[PDB]
UniProtKB/Swiss-Prot annotation, chain B:
GO terms for molecular function: (2E,6E)-farnesyl diphosphate synthase activity; dimethylallyltranstransferase activity; geranylgeranyl diphosphate synthase activity; metal ion binding. It catalyses: isopentenyl diphosphate + dimethylallyl diphosphate = (2E)-geranyl diphosphate + diphosphate; isopentenyl diphosphate + (2E)-geranyl diphosphate = (2E,6E)-farnesyl diphosphate + diphosphate; isopentenyl diphosphate + (2E,6E)-farnesyl diphosphate = (2E,6E,10E)-geranylgeranyl diphosphate + diphosphate. It comes from Saccharomyces cerevisiae (strain ATCC 204508 / S288c) (Baker's yeast). This is Geranylgeranyl pyrophosphate synthase BTS1. It is an enzyme of class 2 (transferase). Keywords: Carotenoid biosynthesis, Cytoplasm, Isoprene biosynthesis, Magnesium, Metal-binding, Protein transport, Transferase, Transport.
Amino acid sequence: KMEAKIDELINNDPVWSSQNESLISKPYNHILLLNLIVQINRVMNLPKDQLAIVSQIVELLHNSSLLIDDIEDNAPLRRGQTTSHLIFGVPSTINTANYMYFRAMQLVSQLTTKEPLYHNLITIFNEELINLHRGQGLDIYWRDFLPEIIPTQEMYLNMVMNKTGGLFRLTLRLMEALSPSHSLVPFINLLGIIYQIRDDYLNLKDFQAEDITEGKLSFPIVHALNFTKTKGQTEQHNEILRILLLRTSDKDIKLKLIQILEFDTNSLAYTKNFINQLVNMIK
Amino acid sequence: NKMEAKIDELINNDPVWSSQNESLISKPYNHILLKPGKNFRLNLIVQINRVMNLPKDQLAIVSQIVELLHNSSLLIDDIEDNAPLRRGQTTSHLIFGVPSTINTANYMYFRAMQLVSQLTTKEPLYHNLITIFNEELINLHRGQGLDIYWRDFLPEIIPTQEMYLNMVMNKTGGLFRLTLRLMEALSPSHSLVPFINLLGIIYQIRDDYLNLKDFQMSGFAEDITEGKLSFPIVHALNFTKTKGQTEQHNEILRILLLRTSDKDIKLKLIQILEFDTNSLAYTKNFINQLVNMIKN
Ligand SMILES: O=P(O)(O)C(O)(Cn1ccnc1)P(=O)(O)O
Ligand SMILES: O=P(O)(O)C(O)(Cn1ccnc1)P(=O)(O)O
Ligand SMILES: [Mg+2]
Ligand SMILES: [Mg+2]
Ligand SMILES: [Mg+2]
Ligand SMILES: [Mg+2]
């Protein structure tokens, strides 16, 4: 009888239920608690149904990438709410995030069955996910190996072209390949750089600032470090490095670094200016 | 304008990635490569090839893909299981940190995916190979998802033997089937899926079993420390509940939830499976029976 039961088991597809699906989706639904795509669809005109799938794909990749990003950055909050890994644990959250990457991958074959186009859609998805990981890997490396390597502005920019530019290009490239109708890739790349630098800027600017606790080589920090190095302001250079290495939650210490950035290096205004220029390129 | 020029060149080009960059983020992965065991996984592919007859060329790429997926899944598994050691060596995440290890492992899943397109230039076939790849990685994550949920939310769910077996069909069967199905799909030459599923089940129950048996004889019985609903444990929990051994049932749950490294506590739990629930003999026997299904 044992053999009978085993025989039936190995000759069938693996058993997966609706209820199993729900257990596994808990970390993902918790982060659940588009107009950019619509707007762009005015140039691409994908039929509405197709656009729904592309959109579903983008939401999966995007949400899964944040679930893992929060474990990677040891983030306690996301949009004011407790992060999924603190509620469901790191194990379930990694696994669920990764599962949705592959679920997102499956939705791609439902965008088209035309064999030439399908290969292209998979190559786009694969290439940009590879880029998201390269950029994320460099961002993480710099932070965790600090002070081994202090990136320059140019190195930061290439990291961003991958870490943030990847999913922006993934959405845009899929729509341009599926479009019935110049590439807007350069534009979406620029959008990605502005979005990231503004993310870094705002994180400090609104502190009145988790990036400090995280110890990330943000755009303002990269400017401050290279400015102090260039001016041979040894003590200020080292004090910035010392605070980031503290992985501190102390607001008084966070404010202290913000002041080095405000008063010694003027990195905030410098970053403010940089963003305004990127934005002007478009205007 | 010099800035706008530089910005213009940046956004009108592919992103810049260097081999130095590539090396720097491959650290967690390169570390697990030192662990031995490759030859055997290769032997499996070779033996299977005697039936499939893939040219050596293609078989080589099938193997690179399987190795990348296997090592990447073990990097993540050790983070998930809080494992200190893998093949007598310190785990990548304890050395390079969880963030780099997760990112690197996931990066390697996408590099493996990329290799699939080196298996053929024919669009129909390519589409089936990518679907197999996609389906079985979805299966790997479904299985891991349950093993991990049962363990971390214990005692919310006490799996039965049947549930354990369905989770293993996904958790381990997934990569066994991935390898075989890519090969069957590539073969110029009945499906071996049922066989490879049995192989995976024997593989997993034996891994669960040896983990306790080696410690009871000499191993670390790290599955007790991890809290894993192993095959022996699932049997003991269901046996105790059925036989009315309330205290034993509860003590088994309590020891799993301590996440303990104390050797005597681990040995007390193993001797409970030995003498009180007889879960060890039951497992040895269950294994032997599955092995006879093949030998006979
Ligand atoms: O600062 P990060 O790069 O981690 C972030 O922008 C996420 N992210 C990840 C990749 N690109 C951006 P978030 O501030 O949302 O935590
Ligand atoms: O016990 P696990 O399932 O975690 C294991 O077998 C790995 N694994 C992961 C998925 N299937 C098997 P290992 O004992 O090598 O840690
Ligand atoms: Mg973050
Ligand atoms: Mg991050
Ligand atoms: Mg493990
Ligand atoms: Mg495991």
